[PDB]
Amino acid sequence: SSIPGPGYCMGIGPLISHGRFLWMGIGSACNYYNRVYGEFMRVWISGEETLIISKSSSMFHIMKHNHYSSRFGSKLGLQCIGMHEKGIIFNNNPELWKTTRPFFMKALSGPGLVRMVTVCAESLKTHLDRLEEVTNESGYVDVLTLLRRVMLDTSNTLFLRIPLDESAIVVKIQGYFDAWQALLIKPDIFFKISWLYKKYEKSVKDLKDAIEVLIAEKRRRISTEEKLEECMDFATELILAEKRGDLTRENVNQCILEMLIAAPDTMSVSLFFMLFLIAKHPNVEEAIIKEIQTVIGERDIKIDDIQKLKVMENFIYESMRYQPVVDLVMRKALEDDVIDGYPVKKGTNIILNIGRMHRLEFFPKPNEFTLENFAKNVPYRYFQPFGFGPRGCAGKYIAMVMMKAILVTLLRRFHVKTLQGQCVESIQKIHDLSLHPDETKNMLEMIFTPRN
Ligand code: HEM
Ligand SMILES: C[C@]12CCC(=O)C=C1CC[C@@H]1[C@@H]2CC[C@]2(C)C(=O)CC[C@@H]12
């Protein structure tokens, strides 16, 4: 088969598509192009031919194989934010990615994943006793900020554990994400004219500088430590590899940065959407509270509990299915291949539109929010909210643990009301790199009223 998608009008086809991405935002552009042309189609971002694909088979093929274990984006943009061949998230150097990832993978599983369940709970508790920091005169909680703060505190105390300005760093993290999102697929042209990106350049510097203070402190503590054997966090593992020959300081410093931002960027917005769903679906809220009573009572949440929380698990999966945050995944072809029908040369970019695929493929009632969609054990080849394979989400296991931990410990204690008729559907969303609330609008607050 030849490849569907708009005409290559001898060099105008690329400019409209890229412009459309820049104009619409990556997510809505992908959805537009999949709705117009096929669920497997071609488009251009800068030069590079870039496939936008929603077919479950292609998704599976692509994520399954090692020769798609790269992403893509502006080299000038990635350099600007420090992800060019440095971290893991947008580190597209295969060998350098290959050696860095294992650090992330160790820290996000085994004993750290077990520690996480109580670290996550204790963090939320402490922030729920300080609700004055987040609540209005009219009782409106800034949930986004609350969640971002506990997610940061959580990440810090598990992976780095240096004291920090929670409030300031959360703002800086948002600044960094905005920049990352802004520059990821900007054309080279953009980067010449400098009163168009210094804005972003400074947001990056602010976060990078703030984190350099913390890693500096962390460096001192490691050098003057007695029991080096006993207390081995992520940041330390990295720093010790730098002290062997294995890693660059620059690379370490980005990995630490990338681990701290991860949860605040994605969990906060995911749980935000999950709370608006619980607010407007009392049928499900009871099922969850019932389950929590059966399973936990008023014992502290414990690792053994999380497997048992089956209803909440389905709620999480359906929330992510129905109203995602990470609705699309950027990959790159490292070797030539035939993919379903069509041929894909190496260097071809790929945007897997997993958000669309979860409304087209396996599910009984795809366009409404119901736990009926997860009544029958869903095969992992029809529902990848995290991705899988050699470059799937490194947080995928611990993320589910963390989301259960915070939902339990919040709902345990509080009923959650949304303002007005507001719901996930009526919230106005930006749909660019991720899918998140447009925070220049308002009515995004909630009300926490107790229980018993
Ligand atoms: C609701 C929460 C989350 C969702 C939905 C999510 C989703 C994803 C997805 C779809 C990817 C792309 C994987 C692929 O290309 O196949 C990804 C990558 C990644 N996620 Fe997450 N994630 C979440 C939370 C987290 C957390 C909490 C962490 C770390 C603490 C994390 C760390 C990462 C990293 C490091 C990668 C890059 C892996 C690589 O490129 O090698 N994620 N995530
Ligand atoms: C989950 C994630 C990482 C941790 C973080 O801090 C923020 C995000 C949101 C954007 C995700 C990204 C991982 C890679 C993703 C899936 C892509 O290939 C396109 C969008 C992007």
Explain what the structure shows.
The PDB classes it as oxidoreductase. Keywords: cytochrome P450, human placenta, estrogen synthase, androstenedione, oxidoreductase. It forms a monomeric assembly. Human placental aromatase cytochrome P450 (CYP19A1): androstenedione complex #2. The protein is Aromatase. The chain is an alpha+beta fold. The chain has one domain (1-452): Orthogonal Bundle (Cytochrome p450), CATH 1.10.630.10. Helices cover 52% and strands 9% of the residues. It contains 17 helices and 11 strands. It has helices at 13-24, 26-36, 56-64, 75-81, 94-107, 111-128, 143-159, 166-183, 188-192, 198-223, 234-243, 249-279, 282-295, 303-308, 310-322, 354-360, 396-413; strands at residues 40-44, 49-53, 140-141, 329-332, 337-339, 342-344, 349-352, 414-418, 429-431, 435-437, 446-450. The strands form 4 sheets. The protein has a 4-stranded mixed β-sheet with strand order 1-2-7-4. A hairpin with a 2-residue loop joins strand 5 (337-339) and strand 6 (342-344). Helix 12 (249-279) crosses helix 15 and helix 13 (282-295) runs antiparallel to helix 15. Residues 71, 89, 261-262, 265-266, 326, 328-330, 433-434 line the site of 4-androstene-3-17-dione.
